[PDB]
């Protein structure tokens, strides 16, 4: 809305290549901590169900050393987690420790040797974690598979780095691990959404109408509209979202048991002519307000960088995309949703 605020945010936001990876930087003056996030794309591993999570556990180990313990002794808590397309390694610390903590983290992530006893130990842990074919698939993979997968996916080229808060720049001199490359380039963005993400009792509905950013806008808009209409009719419809950084399209998750009710609500959207227009206006106002509020928490800024690729895109482009969503975009996606629901 107000141009000087969008301009204010964008002058703190930047993204540049560092070595063979990329660093997205959002500087915050006088922030109390700095958030660093290292994100590895593992979408291709979804055909080996559970391999990405297994790798995540292996990556905490290097020459008998555990990087969670090393970080803990330095007063930093390292958190990691694996979604369908990425494995994240995230930590908070004071800015003075960012360079050394980040380079130590990349030292572990770009280590590619794991002996037999380490692999079998992490497998045993994951099997007990299953009880507390995901368990089956990692039982069919050995040392040579995990080491090859590490060399193919845990590379600078397949890594995104995000550093939020503070005011120092990340450069190659301080992070020489950002050139620790292998003979393998960035892998294809293929993904086994069809098995891991959905099971046979759900359906995926594509929200894809051209624009990467607008797909997120329209997907949230339609999910919010359907939830509100379900509230008024007191439906029981659960609408999940599949919104992933490496996916150009966005997707809605609806139980196969709720398909008829969901289909009725999608058709209900165009019943009131002014409902779509005024709901778009409300969403645009709520989106900007929430961004203003959310840009005070480091983790929330990180979520904008992963969902909307903020850094590659500017905040001005984010709001320009938001302001370009119209009634015709909603109707076009409504029509395509109905065609998918029909067949």
């Amino acid at each position: 809305l107000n141009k000087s605020f969008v301009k204010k945010l964008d002058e703190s936001l930047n993204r540049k290549q560092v070595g063979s990876t990329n660093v997205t930087r959002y500087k915050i003056e006088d922030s109390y901590l700095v958030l660093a996030a290292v994100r590895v794309g593992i979408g291709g591993l979804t055909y080996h169900n559970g391999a990405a999570a297994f790798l995540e556990a292996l990556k905490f180990w290097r020459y008998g050393e555990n990087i969670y313990n090393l970080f803990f002794q330095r007063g930093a808590i390292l958190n990691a987690y694996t979604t369908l397309e990425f494995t994240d390694y995230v930590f908070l610390s004071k800015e003075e420790s960012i360079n050394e903590n980040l380079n130590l983290l990349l030292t572990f992530l770009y280590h590619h040797q794991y002996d037999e006893k380490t692999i079998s130990l992490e497998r045993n842990i994951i099997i007990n974690e299953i009880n507390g074919g995901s368990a089956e698939s990692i039982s069919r993979m050995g040392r040579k598979e995990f080491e090859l997968i590490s060399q193919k996916y845990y590379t600078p080229e397949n890594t995104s780095i995000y550093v939020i808060g503070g005011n120092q720049d990340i450069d190659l001199f301080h992070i020489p691990t950002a050139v620790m490359t292998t003979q393998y380039g960035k892998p294809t963005h293929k993904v086994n959404v069809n098995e891991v993400e959905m099971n046979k009792d759900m359906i995926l509905l594509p929200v894809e109408h051209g624009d990467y950013l607008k797909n997120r806008m329209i997907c949230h808009l339609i999910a919010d509209m359907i939830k509100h209409l379900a509230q008024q009719l007191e439906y029981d419809v659960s609408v999940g979202l599949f919104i992933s950084t490496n996916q150009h399209s966005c997707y809605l998750k609806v139980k196969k048991s709720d398909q008829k009710r969901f289909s009725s609500l999608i058709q209900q959207l165009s019943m009131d002519e002014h409902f779509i227009e005024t709901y778009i206006k409300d969403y645009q106002w709520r989106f900007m307000n929430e961004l203003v509020i959310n840009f005070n928490q480091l983790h929330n800024i990180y979520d904008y960088m992963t969902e909307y690729r903020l850094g590659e895109y500017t905040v001005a482009e984010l709001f320009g995309s938001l302001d370009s969503v119209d009634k015709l975009d909603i109707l076009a996606v409504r029509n395509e949703l109905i065609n998918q629901l029909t067949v």
């Binding site: 109390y32 007063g75 203003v292 840009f295």
Partner: protein, 374 residues
């Protein structure tokens, strides 16, 4: 005009500005006999006022009756886009007061049942929280007054039987919120502004029923132990004891996790309101008597060391920094802390200046007082 403008420099620059008023009450909250009524009307008021005030540039409106060290306060807050980035200026405090006084009684009645159900749910969830249930029972018996434990969020029986003629007490609440004396806090442009210096004196209930065992019978186990500290200073209640709780409770290989791993779901928490350190753990009845004696002996013979103490100082500083990251955590900190601790930099510097000799004073002043088992 304010009597003062206490500007605390070097603050994190947030995207929003904050304007808050904190209104005191010299009565410890057990003395208030209309406690459940004041809670319900306050939530009803917040909901109605929010619908009128939460428009541009205001992003969030806050109005709560909060308890700070066993004294109740009305806390009104306003988050808004600063005028340099706003297409409309923010209402003055006088205009905010006027919106509160313009609240319609029918708007309040439309929220009565919804607010009453919201507060009823908060009391039941609070009393029924499995891990939190043990500590509630101890505070009731240790202090011989269920307002410190079970009825801290309001007595259920009193709250459940409130009718909608509570609407006639709305003028008294509006007057107390608007005309009651208080301190103003203003966050802008990398600084916090306070309108005056008044360190509202804390109150901590004295223990009466020392040494409590709470036997319970119910199948599918839980254990909760409580300790208190004598001669608690501001440094201890705000920094040292929270550090000590983290030392023995959650900082990785805490003393209890290492001690109880020998037997082979542990939690500990220092309640600053009641000056009590709780320790709860899930276990089996066959592990019950052993873990009780094991926990007690470990606390009794506890020792420290400067390397691990330096780590607790680093950890607790970073936890404080994470709270300062949030504009509400910063505001809450500046409201509650006394004197120079109000400045986050001074509070962090005070953490860095603690020494291990402080932990040995705290160990000598430590004493067991309670136990609950299910």
């Amino acid at each position: 005009q304010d009597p003062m403008d206490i500007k605390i420099n070097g603050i994190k620059k947030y995207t929003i500005h904050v304007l808050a008023k904190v209104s005191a009450s010299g009565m410890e909250f057990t003395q208030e006999k209309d406690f459940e009524h004041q809670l319900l009307l306050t939530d009803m008021l917040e909901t109605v006022i929010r619908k009128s005030v939460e428009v541009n540039p205001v992003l969030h409106f806050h109005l709560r009756k909060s308890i700070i060290m066993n004294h109740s306060y009305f806390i009104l807050g306003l988050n808004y886009i600063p005028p340099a980035f706003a297409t409309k200026n923010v209402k003055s405090i006088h205009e905010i007061y006027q919106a509160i006084q313009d609240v319609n009684d029918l708007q309040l009645l439309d929220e009565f049942e919804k607010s009453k159900e919201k507060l009823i749910n908060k009391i039941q969830q609070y009393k029924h929280s499995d891990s939190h249930s043990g500590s509630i029972r101890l505070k009731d018996r240790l202090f011989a007054d269920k307002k410190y434990g079970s009825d801290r969020l309001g007595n259920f029986e009193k709250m459940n039987k409130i009718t909608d003629n509570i609407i006639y007490a709305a003028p008294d609440m509006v007057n107390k919120i608007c005309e009651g004396d208080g301190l103003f806090y203003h966050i802008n442009d990398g600084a916090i502004h306070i309108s005056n210096i008044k360190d509202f004196n804390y109150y901590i209930p004295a223990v009466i029923n020392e040494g409590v065992e709470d036997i319970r019978t119910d199948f599918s186990s839980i254990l909760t132990c409580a300790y208190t500290f004598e001669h608690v200073t501001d440094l201890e209640r705000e920094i040292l004891i929270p550090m000590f709780d983290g030392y023995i409770g959650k900082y990785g290989h805490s003393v209890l996790f290492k001690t109880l791993r020998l037997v082979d779901h542990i939690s500990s928490h220092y309640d600053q309101e009641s000056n009590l350190l709780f320790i709860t753990v899930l276990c089996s009845k066959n592990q019950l008597s052993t873990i009780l004696t094991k926990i007690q002996h470990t606390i009794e013979s506890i020792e420290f060391d400067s390397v691990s103490f330096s780590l607790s100082k680093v950890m607790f500083e970073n936890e404080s920094r994470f709270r300062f990251e949030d504009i509400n955590g910063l505001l809450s900190h500046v409201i509650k802390q006394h004197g120079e601790y109000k400045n986050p930099e001074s509070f962090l510097k005070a953490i860095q200046n603690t020494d291990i000799a402080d932990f040995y004073r705290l160990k000598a002043n430590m004493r067991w007082v309670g136990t609950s088992i299910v």
